[PDB]
Amino acid sequence: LNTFYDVQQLLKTFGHIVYFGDRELEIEFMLDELKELYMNHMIEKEQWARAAAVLRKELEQT
């Protein structure tokens, strides 16, 4: 929805609770997972677009 944490909860719903010790790499992983979820029709286009956007912002902020 709005923050990195929110996206974390979205992906936690689908089993992914990750921590590699590097925010940039965790974000890239998360973006791959979101895309796979959307490609597999498990999340609506609106949620995926917003989730990726939030991750892009987080990436810029880190």
From Swiss-Prot:
It comes from the Bacteria. Transmembrane segments: none annotated. Coiled coil: none annotated. InterPro entries: YqgQ-like (IPR009256), YqgQ-like_sf (IPR023164). This is Uncharacterized protein YqgQ. The lineage of its organism: Bacteria, Bacillati, Bacillota, Bacilli, Bacillales. The gene is yqgQ.
